[PDB]
Amino acid sequence: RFEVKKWNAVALWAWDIVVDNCAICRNHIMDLCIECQANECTVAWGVCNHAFHFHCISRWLKTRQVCPLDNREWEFQKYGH
Amino acid sequence: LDQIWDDLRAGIQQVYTRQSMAKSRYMELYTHVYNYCTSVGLELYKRLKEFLKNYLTNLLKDGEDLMDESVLKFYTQQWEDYRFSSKVLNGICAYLNRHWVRREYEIYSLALVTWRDCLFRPLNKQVTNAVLKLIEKERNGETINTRLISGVVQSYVELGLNEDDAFAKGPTLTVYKESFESQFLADTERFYTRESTEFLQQNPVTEYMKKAEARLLEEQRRVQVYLHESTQDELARKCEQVLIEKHLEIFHTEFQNLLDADKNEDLGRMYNLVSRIQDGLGELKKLLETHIHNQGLAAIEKCGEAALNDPKMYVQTVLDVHKKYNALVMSAFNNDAGFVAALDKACGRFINNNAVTKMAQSSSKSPELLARYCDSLLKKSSKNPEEAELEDTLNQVMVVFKYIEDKDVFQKFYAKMLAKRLVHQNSASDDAEASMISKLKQACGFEYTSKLQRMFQDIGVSKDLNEQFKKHLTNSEPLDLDFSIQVLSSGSWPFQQSCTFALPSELERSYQRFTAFYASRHSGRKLTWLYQLSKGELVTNCFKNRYTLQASTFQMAILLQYNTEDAYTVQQLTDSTQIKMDILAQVLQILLKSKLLVLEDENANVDEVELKPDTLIKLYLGYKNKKLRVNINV
Amino acid sequence: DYRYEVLTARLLKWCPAPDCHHVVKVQYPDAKPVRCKCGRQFCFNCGENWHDPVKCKWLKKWIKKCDRSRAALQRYLFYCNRYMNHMQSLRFEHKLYAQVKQKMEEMQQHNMSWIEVQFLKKAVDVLCQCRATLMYTYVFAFYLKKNNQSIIFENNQADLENATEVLSGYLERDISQDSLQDIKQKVQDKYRYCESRRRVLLQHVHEGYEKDLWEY
Ligand SMILES: [Zn+2]
Ligand SMILES: [Zn+2]
Ligand SMILES: [Zn+2]
Ligand SMILES: [Zn+2]
Ligand SMILES: [Zn+2]
């Protein structure tokens, strides 16, 4: 009838992102960035729903204030933890 | 003068043919010599020179033409007496050396010069020839009365002329070099050239090897009792050129024939002998490399077909060959850098390409076999391994690893096997796993072992988080089951997306509660549950004897689909579980192979007959197993 | 899967080697790299050495004036400076090989083993390959109108350039003596990073070609 006593499932952690390249360092989104790799590196978001490493978009905005896939202004919308 | 010359001549004749006179005689002689030189003694110098020459001629009147064994007993005794007497005479007429040879020849040097002229007479060749004939008892016979040779050698060395050459400096061994050392060296060369070949023509070369070492030791010893010190290096070079450095061909042939045997005691002898000369080890290193290469290759040729499916035997054979020849290299050849390099090159060559790789038609079969050996060695087996033994065996695996060159194939295989071994909760010792990863990282860098470190820390963090879920569950009435989960990363583990499953209604409460709990502690994260590898427990509160099943989640879905009825088909099951066709075929085949589910037929070969979508599946209510807690899995 | 054949004396070509006497025959030309088995390779279409990211026509236009008022001269000076620097370094790689090898014997005789000079050889090979790719990636970068997808490329290749300079700096001096357990680790961690980065650059270039993303 019931026949259930215990269950042990296996699930994968993954960021909630439609595409996976970070489009700045071209690494995999889950991997380390170009800075943390040549030696906390989290994923930031934006209003236009694009995803980049934190330490990539940081320098990109330090130079120019445009989201680098869409010629529009950029401001943070959701940090990643 | 004249009234002084006769008495002084008497005194000088007294001092020679020594009779140990008293102080009065020598003091009065000195008084005479001082009396003359005050009133500038050139005529006295002339008289002394003429007297010395006349006495030397008188002495030569006897003792010349004896030619053997007696010109030594003559010459050494005459030389000792003459040298002592002349030193005393230099004592007597010592006012000449201070105020007439300061405005120019000291008397002792004059006596040495006159005796040198006593050397440049037939005495020179006879004495040296007899000395060489005496040393020609190198063969045997303790007849070399060393006082009959050291005296002659010291005479030659002392006779190095210094009559205002520059001034008294030190050992002027010109006469020694140009009158005795040359003949001695030439005769040594001739004697050794003859006897070495005479011996080598009759006996195996091992005995010649022993004899050559003995002769070198002997000739080093001889220069410490007979000759002068500044002949050791030159005599050593001549003996090294004659005994060895002129038979390298037979040494190389014997070296090969020794390596084909196992004599590890005289290989050390040959290393010593050949290393004594300049760059004679050139052929030895190459020959050793070739031999050890062929030995290892033909050694793992013996396993043949049995090795290709047993990692243990293959890695054991490689380790055995390496161990034996490293043991030989570290004892005989004194850990010489060249021989160690030869061993390393040959080990690389015969590990990489050999009978097993040839049979498998690729050179990436050895790293796979090593990785499978390490797998089979770290799994949780029946025996409980001892820590020291396990650590030692991992250390040996590291050597055989360091000899391979495509260290990437090994990483892929090790990552796959470690993934399986960690997911299925089936591992021997976390300490062993951590140590193995640590030494891989130490031998190949941080970039090599990043995925493995993440794969490890991820299971650690999963174990952490499951306890926190248990803690939080004390306030939310855990419905009916134990929920243990392992949340892995996504870029590290070698696992695919999913297999299109539909969750049964018996698990949805726990699924939703845990996904909501995970969404709480993290900002944005997507758990992509994969059911293709996840097991549990069933209790079967439906049968007669209260069994217990232990199978994957697919069995759970299919079995729980029978909570309503027992008359479902392949299509009817497919509708409610949404599983792929061939996967469902495999799982139903496994179920029917087990005694739980049977077809319409009673004793058919259901394990082989394929099933069609319009085929009923009947729940076998009479199921019974001998033991409890039946494990239905592959 | 590119089937080509090498033989002796629109689908056949002569070998630009100084005195090689062979013919290269291929199934169909795609400006792919072919090896003449005489020790030289070149792309079958144009005739110069193998150039992976940059197309042949731009190589022609760059090599015609290989050596426009005020700023174009500055851009040309910068790009040609980098290109000639890499070419001058590459022409002397025989000296680099001999230097590292003689270092290998020198360091091995001072009480040190063989596997160490082995990893040194591997590092040198990777360094030379990375320089050879940077060579032509600069050429590709020059004929490119600035937009969003060009800043990213010019920013990645600068980092790869810096890493290569770091690698080459490590070798010469910091292989000095008796510090293997760290110098080795640093060299390995550096050349793996360099190789991965150059693979990323080549992938970016070819994907841009496929997706029609650049502007000239
Ligand atoms: Zn980072
Ligand atoms: Zn990034
Ligand atoms: Zn955007
Ligand atoms: Zn050619
Ligand atoms: Zn071309």
Author numbering:
A (entry chain R): 21 to 59, 67 to 108
B (entry chain C): 17 to 55, 84 to 148, 157 to 686
C (entry chain H): 98 to 106, 271 to 328, 406 to 554
Recite the paper's sentences.
Here, by studying CRLs in the SKP1–CUL1–F-box (SCF) family, we show how neddylated SCF ligases and ARIH1 (an RBR-type E3 ligase) co-evolved to ubiquitylate diverse substrates presented on various F-box proteins. We developed activity-based chemical probes that enabled cryo-electron microscopy visualization of steps in E3–E3 ubiquitylation, initiating with ubiquitin linked to the E2 enzyme UBE2L3, then transferred to the catalytic cysteine of ARIH1, and culminating in ubiquitin linkage to a substrate bound to the SCF E3 ligase.
The E3–E3act super-domain adjoins the Ariadne domain of ARIH1 with a composite surface from the RING domain of RBX1 and the ‘CR3’ and ‘4HB’ domains of CUL1. This depends on conformational changes from both E3 ligases.
